[PDB]
Amino acid sequence: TCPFYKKIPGTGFTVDAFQYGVVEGCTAYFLTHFHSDHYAGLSKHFTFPVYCSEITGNLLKNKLHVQEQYIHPLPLDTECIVNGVKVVLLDANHCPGAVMILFYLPNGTVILHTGDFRADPSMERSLLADQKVHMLYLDTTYCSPEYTFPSQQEVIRFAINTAFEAVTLNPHALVVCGTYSIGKEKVFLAIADVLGSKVGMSQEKYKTLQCLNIPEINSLITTDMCSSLVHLLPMMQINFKGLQSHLKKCGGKYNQILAFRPTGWTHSNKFTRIADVIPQTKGNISIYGIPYSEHSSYLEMKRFVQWLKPQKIIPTVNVGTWKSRSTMEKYFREWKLEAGY
Numbered sequence: 001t002c003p004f005y006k007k008i009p010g011t012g013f014t015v016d017a018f019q020y021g022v023v024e025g026c027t028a029y030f031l032t033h034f035h036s037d038h039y040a041g042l043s044k045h046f047t048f049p050v051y052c053s054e055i056t057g058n059l060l061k062n063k064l065h066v067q068e069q070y071i072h073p074l075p076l077d078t079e080c081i082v083n084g085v086k087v088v089l090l091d092a093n094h095c096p097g098a099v100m101i102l103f104y105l106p107n108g109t110v111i112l113h114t115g116d117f118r119a120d121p122s123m124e125r126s127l128l129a130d131q132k133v134h135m136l137y138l139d140t141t142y143c144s145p146e147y148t149f150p151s152q153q154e155v156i157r158f159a160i161n162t163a164f165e166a167v168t169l170n171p172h173a174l175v176v177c178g179t180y181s182i183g184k185e186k187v188f189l190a191i192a193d194v195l196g197s198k199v200g201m202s203q204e205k206y207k208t209l210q211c212l213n214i215p216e217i218n219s220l221i222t223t224d225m226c227s228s229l230v231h232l233l234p235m236m237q238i239n240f241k242g243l244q245s246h247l248k249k250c251g252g253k254y255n256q257i258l259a260f261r262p263t264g265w266t267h268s269n270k271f272t273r274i275a276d277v278i279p280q281t282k283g284n285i286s287i288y289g290i291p292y293s294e295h296s297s298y299l300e301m302k303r304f305v306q307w308l309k310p311q312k313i314i315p316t317v318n319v320g321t322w323k324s325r326s327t328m329e330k331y332f333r334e335w336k337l338e339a340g341y
């Protein structure tokens with residue numbers, strides 16, 4: 001059954017709760033973003049109202065084939081009413097179309113659900129600043145002090161300079177970027193922009209990008225692999241074997257590959273700065289691991305929560321074992337004692 005952390009008290013609303021069949025009492029199902037863990041169970045066969053951003057609605061319509069009658073897209077930064085209750089959707093700084101939701105309960109309680117998010121100080125000057133928030137449902141993916149990572153902009157600058165140098169040294173080199181879902185689009189679009197190229201990709205991936213309301217998208221992407229010097233491939237193919245194989249496929253139009261695997265955290269975040277990063281190399285193929293994160297680091301999460309000062313925190317990630325829950329509660333108490341709420 002639907003866990004308490006996916007329910008919003010004093011409404012019949014749920015959030016990211018599609019895998020449990022009909023939820024007893026639920027009149028509206030919110031979807032924070034289009035990642036399969038969160039949407040799991042949604043398909044053309046679902047027949048209840050789904051509330052979400054415009055981008056998330058385009059994906060539901062076109063990729064999942066959910067019937068249009070059940071999609072209720074809502075604009076951002078706008079006070080709306082859903083089944084008698086005031087809500088606001090905010091940018092989560094996660095993947096395209098990802099939202100946090102602010103719920104103003106009839107009793108006067110205010111609840112923020114972050115969805116998946118990468119906390120940022122720009123969130124301190126949104127509609128959140130205008131009133132007290134009593135309860136916070138928090139993306140706790142990286143809630144431990146070992147999880148540090150560079151800013152998105154440091155990582156993109158590194159990727160840009162790296163790609164530019166390599167293709168100026170060898171104008172017959174191909175750049176490959178790995179991908180599995182939506183998110184991290186800036187990696188491949190920034191590389192392409194410094195090389196004066198479109199990004200080539202499969203028909204399924206092009207269809208996905210065409211849903212995302214990216215300005216001038218038709219000038220940036222193509223399904224003609226031949227005509228482009230930055231290609232997208234599935235993350236699974238980003239290895240020496242998969243990359244040599246793809247290089248055979250391109251018809252001797254390129255004689256070298258430089259590939260990027262955008263990952264989350266891995267253990268080498270604890271020493272190495274982005275400037276020290278060096279690739280793995282085998283012959284004419286080089287692979288760079290770059291920690292481009294769309295979740296809060298420990299310090300980013302801690303700052304946001306210390307600013308917000310919630311009366312209660314409900315974790316939404318890593319809640320499946322008591323050891324994890326216990327560890328997270330410890331950090332929440334530390335943050336509260338330090339900041340005086």
Ligand code: NI
Nearest residue numbers: 033035094116
């Ligand atoms: Ni996500």
